[PDB]
Design a protein. Sequence first.
Length: 105
Amino acid sequence: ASIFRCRQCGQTISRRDWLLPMGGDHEHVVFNPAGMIFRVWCFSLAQGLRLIGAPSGEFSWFKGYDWTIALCGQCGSHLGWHYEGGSQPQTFFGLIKDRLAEGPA
Ligand SMILES: Nc1cccc2c1C(=O)N([C@H]1CCC(=O)NC1=O)C2=O
Ligand SMILES: [Zn+2]
């Protein structure tokens, strides 16, 4: 249980080693304006995604950061968001825990 894959298809996405304690905890539970609750795990790094469009600050869960939707690059499943434009770090990924599968490298 060291690498994270897309639950829907298997695409390699991230690694346990790349978890990022933002504000002291890698896990942040948040809601969007449609009321959907997400258990977001922050990662300093991820691969295998497709980052869609240009960034937006609207509704951002992380102060100082703008977001882009992050899809699985293989199957299109919405896996989370890429955050940029901030500070320490300038960028990171916020991925929806239950949309990944954990397993051996
Ligand atoms: N405006 C809408 C409308 C529908 C769904 C979402 C947003 C929205 O902003 N986010 C996220 C994007 C990422 C973020 O940081 N905050 C959000 O509320 C959504 O899931
Ligand atoms: Zn996928």
